[PDB]
Write a protein that binds this ligand. Structure first.
Ligand SMILES: O=C(O)c1cc(O)cc(-c2ccc(C(=O)O)c(OCc3ccccc3)c2)c1
Length: 243
């Protein structure tokens, strides 16, 4: 009994006029939980959650030297203000700076990128489409369930890249921490191909356990993007994982 459905969490989506799936994995008990077993195994475009493997690959191949190397703004003014500045790996991941990671993808190239995704067993391991946007509008797909499996390898330094690469990416994933918990996670927003979805994948570190998580929800407009974290935290409080 390693997977179990719990439809009570649907109340949180409903209260917010929303549809989606939340997947939790208790590492100690080696047990999973979700409010919709079928949606949890349906594969979607990773969108900017792909910045986790993209980062690992850029670092192992030396495209990126470390988390301090500066990537200069190219001077094109884009719609997202925080993109129009210089970034390092920490801030590029935090603000989902797509044009920085498209540069990484072009430097990596099609053959290296495909070979690395096979090694990771990442999603359907399909890179068909454009070299620098296939995670936003090409052939790659991945499920919430498949995200957790990838994230667990990363937590334990099991992926087919150096341990240094995986430690740097887990540092850059840092999102929030206090005396009660640590969250390492990555947001995503898939709008180029229907259905438009928001993502949030990562884990919650406690003193004596870690809860992995992966959620996606339908997202017609950008105004509801905060619900990704809100609905996840509401599920987390219900399960007494955070206070
Ligand atoms: O990761 C997040 O949460 C996040 C948050 C955001 O505000 C925006 C995005 C994001 C990432 C990639 C694309 C793309 O497909 O290039 C994208 O669409 C273009 C676009 C949409 C809306 C306003 C300006 C521009 C949006 C992601």
């Amino acid at each position: 009994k390693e997977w179990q459905e719990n439809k009570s969490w649907n109340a949180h989506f409903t209260e917010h006029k929303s549809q989606g799936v939340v997947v939790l994995w208790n590492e100690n008990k080696q047990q999973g939980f979700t409010n919709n077993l079928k949606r949890a195994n349906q594969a979607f475009l990773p969108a900017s959650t792909f910045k986790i493997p993209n980062s690992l690959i850029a670092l192992d191949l030396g495209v990126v030297k470390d988390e301090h190397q500066v990537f200069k703004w190219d001077g094109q003014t884009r719609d997202i203000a925080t993109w129009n500045r210089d970034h390092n790996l920490i801030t590029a991941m935090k603000y989902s700076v797509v044009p920085v990671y498209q540069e990484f993808a072009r430097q990596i190239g099609e053959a290296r990128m495909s070979k690395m995704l096979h090694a990771f067993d990442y999603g359907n391991e399909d890179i068909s489409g454009n070299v620098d946007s296939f995670w936003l509008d090409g052939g790659i797909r991945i499920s919430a369930t498949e995200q957790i499996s990838f994230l667990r390898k990363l937590y334990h330094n099991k992926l087919h890249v150096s341990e240094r690469s995986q430690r740097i990416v887990k540092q850059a994933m840092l999102t929030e921490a206090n005396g009660d918990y640590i969250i390492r996670a990555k947001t995503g927003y898939s709008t180029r191909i229907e259905p438009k979805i928001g993502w949030w994948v990562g884990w919650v570190e406690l003193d004596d356990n870690v809860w992995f998580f992966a959620m996606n929800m339908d997202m017609p407009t950008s105004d509801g993007l905060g619900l990704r974290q809100a609905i996840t935290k509401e599920v987390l409080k219900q399960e007494k994982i955070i206070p």
